[PDB]
Amino acid sequence: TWLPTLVTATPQEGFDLAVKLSRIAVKKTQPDAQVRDTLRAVYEKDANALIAVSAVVATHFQTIAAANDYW
Amino acid sequence: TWLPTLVTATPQEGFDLAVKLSRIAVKKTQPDAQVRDTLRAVYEKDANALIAVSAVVATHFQTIAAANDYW
Amino acid sequence: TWLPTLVTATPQEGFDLAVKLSRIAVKKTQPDAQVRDTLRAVYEKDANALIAVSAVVATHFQTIAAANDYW
Amino acid sequence: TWLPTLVTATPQEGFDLAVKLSRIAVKKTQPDAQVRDTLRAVYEKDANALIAVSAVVATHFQTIAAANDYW
Amino acid sequence: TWLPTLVTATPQEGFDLAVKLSRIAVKKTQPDAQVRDTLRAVYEKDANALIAVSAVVATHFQTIAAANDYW
Amino acid sequence: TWLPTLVTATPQEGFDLAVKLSRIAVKKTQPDAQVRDTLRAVYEKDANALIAVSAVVATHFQTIAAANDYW
Numbered sequence: 001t002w003l004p005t006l007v008t009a010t011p012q013e014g015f016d017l018a019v020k021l022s023r024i025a026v027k028k029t030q031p032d033a034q035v036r037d038t039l040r041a042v043y044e045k046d047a048n049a050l051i052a053v054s055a056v057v058a059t060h061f062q063t064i065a066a067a068n069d070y071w
Numbered sequence: 072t073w074l075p076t077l078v079t080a081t082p083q084e085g086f087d088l089a090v091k092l093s094r095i096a097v098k099k100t101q102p103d104a105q106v107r108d109t110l111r112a113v114y115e116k117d118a119n120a121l122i123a124v125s126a127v128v129a130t131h132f133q134t135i136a137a138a139n140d141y142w
Numbered sequence: 143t144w145l146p147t148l149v150t151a152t153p154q155e156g157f158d159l160a161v162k163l164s165r166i167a168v169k170k171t172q173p174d175a176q177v178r179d180t181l182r183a184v185y186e187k188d189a190n191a192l193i194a195v196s197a198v199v200a201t202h203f204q205t206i207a208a209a210n211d212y213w
Numbered sequence: 214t215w216l217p218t219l220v221t222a223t224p225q226e227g228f229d230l231a232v233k234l235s236r237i238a239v240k241k242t243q244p245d246a247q248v249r250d251t252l253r254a255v256y257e258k259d260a261n262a263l264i265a266v267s268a269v270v271a272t273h274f275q276t277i278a279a280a281n282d283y284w
Numbered sequence: 285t286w287l288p289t290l291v292t293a294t295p296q297e298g299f300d301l302a303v304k305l306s307r308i309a310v311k312k313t314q315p316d317a318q319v320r321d322t323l324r325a326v327y328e329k330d331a332n333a334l335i336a337v338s339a340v341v342a343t344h345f346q347t348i349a350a351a352n353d354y355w
Numbered sequence: 356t357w358l359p360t361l362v363t364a365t366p367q368e369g370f371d372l373a374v375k376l377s378r379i380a381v382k383k384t385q386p387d388a389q390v391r392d393t394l395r396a397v398y399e400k401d402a403n404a405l406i407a408v409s410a411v412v413a414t415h416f417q418t419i420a421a422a423n424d425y426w
């Protein structure tokens with residue numbers, strides 16, 4: 001039971017839930033934590049990757065903001 | 072009959088379905104399970120590929136979440 | 143008369159309609175079926191392309207799910 | 214006056230308008246019809262370009278479809 | 285006071301507002317007009333860039349169409 | 356407490372918040388402000404990077420605009 005609800009007390013908590021939702025898709029499709037570390041070293045310093053990341057969390061934040069009727 | 076409903080009990084199973092839906096699209100377009108195996112070996116270790124992947128499911132989760140009235 | 147309605151009997155039929163809607167954009171912008179075959183040989187085996195494909199059908203499935211009030 | 218309304222009789226004409234809308238954006242940004250011809254020759258034979266293209270129209274179709282109350 | 289409202293008299297005016305909204309994000313993140321000119325010379329003739337542009341304005345047009353209850 | 360509310364007085368401040376939200380995502384993922392400086396130097400002069408950037412904020416603006424009932 002990792003995703004109980006989308007209901008979030010503050011908009012802030014929603015954005016962290018949004019970052020969370022983004023990473024869990026990743027952890028599911030690549031559960032090998034050893035390779036998840038090796039790729040981190042790569043994208044953490046890649047501009048386009050980091051923009052692309054914000055893109056994902058943007059989509060999710062849209063879903064959870066609506067879940068909270070925009071707090 | 073693989074996609075009976077968008078209704079899901081919890082957000083967790085909303086996210087799992089979102090993931091499945093993401094996958095069935097590639098399965099329909101590229102049915103040769105063998106080549107699917109070849110490319111798995113390429114994207115599972117790609118950073119940009121994994122973030123892209125997270126995005127697709129983020130769009131899908133957005134649909135089902137709405138379909139469940141956000142739990 | 144290729145696109146009569148977005149109304150779909152089952153969620154499943156909506157996803158196939160979504161895959162359809164994705165390909166018709168392609169067929170319109172590149173009606174030369176000869177080059178559509180040559181490009182198929184290329185993207186059918188490209189991981190990023192295949193993710194990108196799921197992305198498109200994801201957007202469309204969002205539109206048709208809503209059209210069916212999520213079945 | 215090129216974009217009078219988003220109202221469209223059928224979904225088919227919804228998709229055609231979606232396509233047009235996609236195109237008018239590139240036409241506005243790059244008005245030199247000649248170079249537009251040069252690049253046409255490059256993307257019409259690009260796979261990733263065609264899928265990208267399908268995506269833009271998928272976003273647009275999403276807007277008008279909503280504007281037509283989904284027919 | 286550059287962005288007073290999203291309310292637009294005609295759908296057409298909404299698309300121009302959408303193109304506007306797209307460029308202002310750019311002007312904010314890169315206010316040096318000298319480098320904005322140098323990059324223009326580059327993307328104005330890049331197919332994928334020009335598709336990518338239409339993608340942005342597509343998202344925005346979705347937001348402003350809704351703002352106008354689709355005119 | 357950095358994200359107190361999505362409510363914004365004007366669309367202008369809607370767009371500014373949208374931009375901020377876009378940035379906080381990269382700040383959370385990559386907190387080492389120093390490397391953030393290094394990559395700034397790379398994307399601020401990239402065309403595809405700037406359009407990508409505009410897209411993220413276009414998604415975000417879509418969320419808050421909805422949260423403000425479009426002003």
Ligand code: HEM
Binds near residue numbers: 195
């Ligand atoms: C917009 C995203 C796209 C989606 C969702 C999509 C989906 C599909 C699907 C589901 C099939 C059937 C595969 C099978 O059952 O064997 C297919 C086949 C095919 N697609 Fe795509 N496609 C997309 C883009 C493209 C593009 C850009 C091209 C090239 C211009 C293309 C060319 C083809 C061709 C030629 C086939 C028939 C392949 C064969 O002979 O087996 N498609 N596509």
Ligand code: HEM
Binds near residue numbers: 093
């Ligand atoms: C829409 C984006 C995609 C998502 C969300 C996704 C998700 C997943 C997940 C959750 C798994 C299970 C991983 C595990 O339990 O270790 C998986 C495995 C797999 N995927 Fe993807 N995938 C995507 C795209 C693709 C593509 C483009 C391909 C290649 C054609 C592909 C081929 C495979 C294969 C063959 C496996 C089984 C791998 C193994 O043997 O461990 N997937 N995927």
Ligand code: HEM
Binds near residue numbers: 241244319402
């Ligand atoms: C966000 C997506 C963008 C859109 C929708 C967009 C749209 C437009 C449009 C419609 C024009 C007017 C073209 C004309 O009438 O001649 C234009 C011009 C221009 N754009 Fe973009 N643009 C985008 C991104 C960018 C970026 C990333 C840059 C570089 C930082 C840029 C720099 C310029 C410049 C310098 C001009 C004036 C070009 C000239 O001197 O004719 N734009 N853009």
Ligand code: HEM
Binds near residue numbers: 172173232235243
């Ligand atoms: C937003 C994504 C786009 C869509 C949906 C789109 C769609 C289309 C369609 C449906 C056609 C008619 C094809 C035919 O009847 O054979 C076409 C042709 C054309 N497009 Fe695109 N296009 C897009 C982007 C672009 C871009 C970026 C350029 C280059 C600046 C471009 C330049 C052209 C030109 C010059 C033609 C006429 C080609 C010919 O002479 O056959 N389009 N496009």
Ligand code: HEM
Binds near residue numbers: 019035038053385386
């Ligand atoms: C889906 C988009 C993603 C988002 C929003 C995201 C976000 C984050 C955030 C906020 C952190 C914490 C950073 C810190 O506080 O130091 C983090 C760390 C990390 N991420 Fe990502 N991430 C994404 C994709 C990925 C991918 C694709 C991978 C590789 C498979 C990955 C691997 C890691 C690892 C290993 C860490 C821990 C790094 C460390 O040891 O400091 N993430 N991520």
Ligand code: HEM
Binds near residue numbers: 391
């Ligand atoms: C989500 C997309 C992004 C948006 C909307 C965005 C927006 C902005 C804006 C509006 C500024 C102020 C520019 C000025 O006043 O001259 C800025 C500056 C800056 N950005 Fe971004 N940014 C994005 C992504 C990133 C990324 C990926 C990085 C690198 C990790 C980054 C690092 C920086 C840094 C270090 C500055 C300060 C630059 C300076 O000293 O002038 N941003 N950004």
